[PDB]
Design a protein around this ligand. Structure first.
Ligand SMILES: COc1ccc2c(c1)c(CC(=O)O)c(C)n2C(=O)c1ccc(Cl)cc1
Ligand SMILES: CCCCCCCCCCCCCCCC(=O)O
Ligand SMILES: CCCCCCCCCCCCCCCC(=O)O
Ligand SMILES: CCCCCCCCCCCCCCCC(=O)O
Ligand SMILES: CCCCCCCCCCCCCCCC(=O)O
Ligand SMILES: CCCCCCCCCCCCCCCC(=O)O
Ligand SMILES: CCCCCCCCCCCCCCCC(=O)O
Length: 581
């Protein structure tokens, strides 16, 4: 790297370079229009080419940070539009780049991106593919200034793939709409995960992160020796620590350094990394992060020997407590790919707590002899919740499963906004659809990754406008206790029924023409208000009010005249429902 631009241009290729530069500027100049970004990208790209042709050509030896910051400072409208950020340009480069980092705005007032009609989108794509995808790349990037740029590039390539398939085909919308909802979903979850993982780093600390990573890595690479795992985790901590501070280039080099080290030590790590390690720089680290679990060594010993039975458990423990507990976690985790990480950390903390107690006592050995018994209830709690909830999901499917979740949660925390209860019960229900399709042995993992994001979403909303000390309690709990605290929420005995409000339970003919989704949401919103108003209501009384509403809606949308029915029979539902509750 006599010239860092030329080297990156050569490593990326022109198309990836141009996209990544568009995303990087999009995340810093969130208010400047597309055409101004197209102009920055073309200028940085002309410049890069000059350096590829001649590494000694003028300005080519400058740092990428330097070049990025100088282009920002050439934006003539910078002060008028972004203000404080323009004062970063008066700084000398080390402190300058630090100043730009603080002056991104997480979440700007930008209007929601409306999904155009399938036919408008498909024609847009066909006429000018590059500006269709790029404009929307710009639009996403500016709305998510913290999303890892190469992952956003990963999503774009999948969108593009979706249009290329679905737009020359028989029924475009029935192909394209399912692809786009899943991309939408998966993109929203990716953004929330990145956010979560940096918040968790700050809240819960470096130790907690290392434990998490030791557990996840040991499941992934069970053939790796513990020293290799601790080496990966120590470099991962650095990397994630740097990525959370937010400097794209430094994050990308750190991730590239890890991926390079991992790829150069495959045989010492995992037999599943061949295909990731053959990919170009840009995708390597992404592929490695997603790689499948290696198969565990076939005849591994019991953990009682090193952690229960040997003399010097206490000696080994006292000498390096975190190293010992790390080893316990490594050995437990590599044996249990079927466990959630968080369950593996519960188990580790149960072992820590017992060592702490037992190594003091005169006979530690008798004291901690039954620690493995303490793991039993810990393992079975999540396994049964998952049993019960998938069995329920199978009987009364996704939509009806949602309505079950919606009654449950509304009674536990009636103080929570109706939209919030609907959305999180909708989301929980989707995690049902997905994870109950896995066999038991794969389910707890599936549960964890998605529930982690549903629960953090839940807590951030609730921190913005609190409402329940109990939701606040669980939201502030240790990361291992979050979900069990929510699971220990009982029906709220304090709560005073919300008062009657007839508009809430008035429905018009508008509902039989609404989309499937919109009719479902409208019905769920009424369900919650019903429960809020009648939280004393038993199972059978709700089902009787629900089957009646369902018969009422078919009556009024099968009829020769609808609007009279959606008002006549609405009196003959609401009045009977109150009396029966
Ligand atoms: C192959 O090189 C890498 C590079 C970076 C990685 C990983 C692997 C893995 C995982 C793996 O190796 O399976 C993670 C998780 N990486 C992150 O940057 C990251 C993102 C969010 C958080 Cl909270 C923490 C770290
Ligand atoms: C990443 C690049 C995004 C390109 C896809 C945009 C088209 C769809 C608009 C948003 C939506 O439909 O939900
Ligand atoms: C290479 C070893 C690194 C060790 C990293 C920390 C190991 C701690 C294991 C105890 C359980 C940790 C669970 C997080 C919550 C907590 O206990 O504070
Ligand atoms: C004139 C300024 C140019 C701006 C450069 C834009 C940022 C390009 C760097 C991103 C490359 C990603 C490298 C992959 C690393 C990884 O995640 O494995
Ligand atoms: C799978 C079905 C999930 C349906 C959503 C409502 C139940 C969620 C509870 C599942 C348990 C999550 C495991 C993570 C943990 O161990 O804390
Ligand atoms: C604004 C705060 C939002 C809270 C909305 C309530 C949603 C239900 C929260 C409790 C359940 C979380 C999942 C725990 C698993 C279980 O059901 O046992
Ligand atoms: C006070 C009493 C108000 C009574 C109004 C009835 C509202 C009921 C909402 C029903 C939700 C229906 C979902 C079940 C289904 O689609 O089969």
């Amino acid at each position: 790297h006599k010239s860092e631009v030329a080297h990156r241009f050569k490593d990326l290729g022109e198309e990836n370079f141009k996209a990544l530069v568009l995303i990087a500027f999009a995340q810093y100049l969130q208010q400047c229009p597309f055409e101004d970004h197209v102009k920055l990208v073309n200028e940085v790209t002309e410049f890069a080419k000059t350096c590829v042709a001649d590494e000694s050509a003028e300005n080519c030896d400058k740092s990428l940070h330097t070049l990025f910051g100088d282009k920002l400072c050439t934006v003539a409208t910078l002060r008028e539009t972004y203000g404080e950020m323009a004062d970063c340009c008066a700084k000398q480069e080390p402190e300058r780049n630090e100043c730009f980092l603080q002056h991104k705005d997480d979440n700007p007032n930008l209007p929601r991106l409306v999904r155009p009609e399938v036919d408008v989108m498909c024609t847009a794509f066909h006429d000018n593919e590059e500006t269709f995808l790029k404009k929307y790349l710009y639009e996403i990037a500016r709305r998510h200034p913290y999303f890892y740029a190469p992952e956003l590039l990963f999503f774009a390539k999948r969108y593009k793939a979706a249009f290329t398939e679905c737009c020359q085909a028989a029924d475009k919308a029935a192909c394209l709409l399912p692809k786009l909802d899943e991309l939408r979903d998966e993109g929203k979850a990716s953004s929330a995960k990145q956010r979560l993982k940096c918040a968790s780093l700050q809240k819960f600390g470096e130790r907690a992160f290392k434990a998490w990573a030791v557990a996840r890595l040991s499941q992934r690479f069970p053939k790796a020796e513990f020293a290799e795992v601790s080496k990966l985790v120590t470099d991962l901590t650095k990397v994630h620590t740097e990525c959370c501070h937010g400097d794209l280039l430094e994050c990308a080099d750190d991730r590239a350094d890890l991926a390079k080290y991992i790829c150069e030590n495959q045989d010492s790590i995992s037999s599943k990394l061949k295909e990731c390690c053959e990919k170009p720089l840009l995708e390597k680290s992404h592929c490695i992060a997603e790689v499948e679990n290696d198969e565990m060594p076939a005849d591994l010993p019991s953990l009682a020997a090193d952690f229960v039975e040997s003399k010097d458990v206490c000696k080994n423990y006292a000498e390096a407590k975190d190293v010992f507990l790390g080893m316990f976690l490594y050995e437990y985790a590599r044996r249990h790919p079927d466990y959630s990480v968080v369950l593996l950390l519960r188990l580790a903390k149960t072992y820590e707590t017992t060592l702490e107690k037992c190594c003091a006592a005169a006979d530690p050995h008798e004291c901690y002899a039954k620690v493995f018994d303490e793991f039993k209830p810990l393992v079975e709690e999540p396994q049964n919740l998952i049993k019960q909830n998938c069995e329920l999901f199978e009987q009364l499917g996704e939509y009806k499963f949602q309505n079950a979740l919606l009654v449950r949660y509304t009674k536990k925390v009636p103080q929570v906004s109706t939209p919030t209860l609907v959305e999180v019960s909708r989301n929980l229900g989707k995690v049902g659809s997905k994870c109950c399709k896995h066999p038991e042995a794969k389910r707890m993992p599936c549960a964890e990754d998605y529930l982690s994001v549903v629960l953090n979403q839940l807590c951030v909303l609730h921190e913005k406008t609190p409402v329940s000390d109990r939701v606040t309690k669980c939201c502030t709990e240790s990361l291992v206790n979050r979900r069990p605290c929510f699971s220990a929420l009982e029906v709220d005995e304090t709560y005073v029924p919300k008062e009657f409000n007839a508009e809430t339970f008035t429905f018009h003919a508008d509902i039989c023409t609404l989309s499937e989704k919109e009719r479902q949401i409208k019905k769920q919103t009424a369900l919650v208000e019903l429960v809020k108003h009648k939280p004393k209501a038993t199972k059978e009384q709700l089902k009787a009010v629900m089957d009646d509403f369902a018969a009422f809606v078919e009556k009024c949308c099968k009829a020769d005249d609808k609007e009279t029915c959606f008002a006549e029979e609405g009196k003959k539902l609401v009045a009977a429902s109150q009396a029966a509750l």
